[PDB]
A paper describes a structure:
I-CreI is a homodimeric member of LHEs family, which recognizes and cleaves a 22 bp pseudo-palindromic target (5′- CAAAACGTCGTGAGACAGTTTG -3′). Each I-CreI monomer binds its own DNA target region generating the catalytic centre at the dimer interface. This region contains two catalytic aspartic acids (D20, one per each monomer). The aspartic side chains participate in the cleavage of the DNA strands along the minor groove, resulting in the hydrolysis of specific phosphodiester bonds upon the coordination of three divalent metal ions.
To decipher why a G at this position restricts cleavage, we made DNA substitutions in the cleavable DNA target to render it non-cleavable. For this purpose, we exchanged GT in positions −5 and −4 of the wild type coding strand target (I-CreI_D75N_target, Fig. 1b upper sequence) by TG, generating the non-cleavable target I-CreI_D75N_target-null. The absence of the central metal ion in the non-cleaved structures, would explain the different catalytic behaviour. To assess unambiguously the number of catalytic ions present in the active site, we solved the crystal structure of the two proteins in complex with both target DNAs in the presence of Mn2+, which allows catalysis and unambiguous detection and location through its anomalous diffraction signal. In addition, Mn2+ is less restrictive than Mg2+17 allowing phosphoryl transfer reactions in non-ideal substrates, including the non-cleavable targets studied here. In-depth analysis showed differences in the occupancy of the central metal at the active site between cleavable and non-cleavable targets. A high occupancy level of the central metal ion is essential for the cleavage, and the lower occupancy level of the central Mn2+ ion found in the non-cleavable targets (46% and 74% for I-CreI_D75N_target-null and I-CreI_3115_target-null, respectively) compared with the cleavable ones (100% in both cases) revealed that the non-cleavable targets interfere with the positioning of the central metal ion affecting catalysis. Our results clearly point out that in the cases of I-CreI_D75N_target-null and I-CreI_3115_target-null sequences bound to the I-CreI_D75N and I-CreI_3115 proteins, A at position +1 largely deviates with respect to the usual B-DNA conformation. In particular, we found that in ~ 30% (I-CreI_D75N_target-null) and ~ 60% (I-CreI_3115_target-null) of the simulation time A +1 is not paired and is found stacked to the corresponding nucleobases. The larger flexibility of the A +1 in the active centre explains the low occupancy of the central metal ion within the active site, disturbing the positioning of the P-O bond for catalysis, thus inhibiting cleavage.
Author numbering:
A (entry chain A): 2 to 155
B (entry chain B): 202 to 354
DNA sequence: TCAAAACGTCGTAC
DNA sequence: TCAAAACTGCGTAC
DNA sequence: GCAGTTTTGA
DNA sequence: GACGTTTTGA
């Protein structure tokens, strides 16, 4: 797998702790087996005027993309297995967001097996709670005990 | 005159490009020669719940302090001498605030010199102009031209 | 007078 | 059904 | 920053 | 985040 330079990871770890975001979501979607999608997102926000910085991350991380949303842009990394590679090498240098990073890694490994059982699928949903608790969460809606609800009504 | 660990500078440079501010101001104060104080501030902002992060900074930079303001806390470094030392070491790793880092570095070297002539001081004031230019400035008032605007008297 | 601190404001860039 | 994308809403932490 | 809701496209 | 205003203390 792609092995990133230490000096890059050190700088990048500091920037992510500043303006990055590591997100786990339970997305209500009827298309899905347990009526919910597990979504992981690594994200670095920056004012579009400085877009070049985010675009250079695409070059250096070697995967991911940049979306421009008006006056702000975001580098996005959603593909679950490059995510795993990248967060694995970054996680040792993160101070503020290390616990989130390690959970997202954990969820990724326990995700094939999260499709087998509603009991297991609930356990992983629990982990997502923990990630959102560690974040500066303000507008979250779908907890694991929301999944719990409509896994009983089924 | 401390030498900071390189693995530390690399990380801190990232965090600073993220939530840090390298501020140069011109402060209308009658007490001063030309009725203005040149002020330099290095600062890192964080929600107070993470004040421990800012604490650690103070410990590792060895100089500077932490201020609270309700929900938000700040690491602050203003003393001209260690500011020069620290920025000189940090500067080569910055990517978004490297320009500001250096302009400050050079305003400092010129500080005693700028206490000499009206012509010189306000040249330094246009270096301060440039620093707000690079920053996400939104509420600036005293620019370098309200400086000799006053020196028009 | 001067370095440096202390306290407030304001608009985003996250 | 699923991984992944696309887009919007929103309240701060800067 | 950290979510939400929706859509793609096999 | 990036300021402004004001005060300390020799
Ligand atoms: Mn931050
Ligand atoms: Mn929280
Ligand atoms: Mn930033
Ligand atoms: Mn920020
Ligand atoms: Mn600007």
């Amino acid at each position: 797998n792609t092995k990133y330079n230490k000096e890059f990871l050190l700088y990048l770890a500091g920037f992510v702790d500043g303006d990055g975001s590591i997100i786990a979501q339970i997305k209500p979607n009827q298309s899905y087996k347990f009526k919910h999608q597990l979504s992981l997102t690594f994200q670095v926000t920056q004012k579009t005027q400085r877009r070049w910085f985010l675009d250079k991350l695409v070059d250096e991380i070697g995967v991911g993309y940049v979306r421009d949303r008006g006056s702000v842009s975001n580098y996005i990394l959603s593909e679950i297995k490059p995510l795993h590679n990248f967060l694995t090498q970054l996680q040792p240098f993160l101070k503020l967001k290390q616990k989130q990073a390690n959970l997202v890694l954990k969820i990724i490994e326990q995700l094939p097996s999260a499709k087998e059982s509603p009991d297991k699928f609930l356990e992983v949903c629990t982990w997502v709670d923990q990630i959102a608790a560690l974040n500066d969460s303000k507008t979250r809606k779908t907890t694991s005990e929301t999944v719990r609800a409509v896994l009983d009504a089924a």
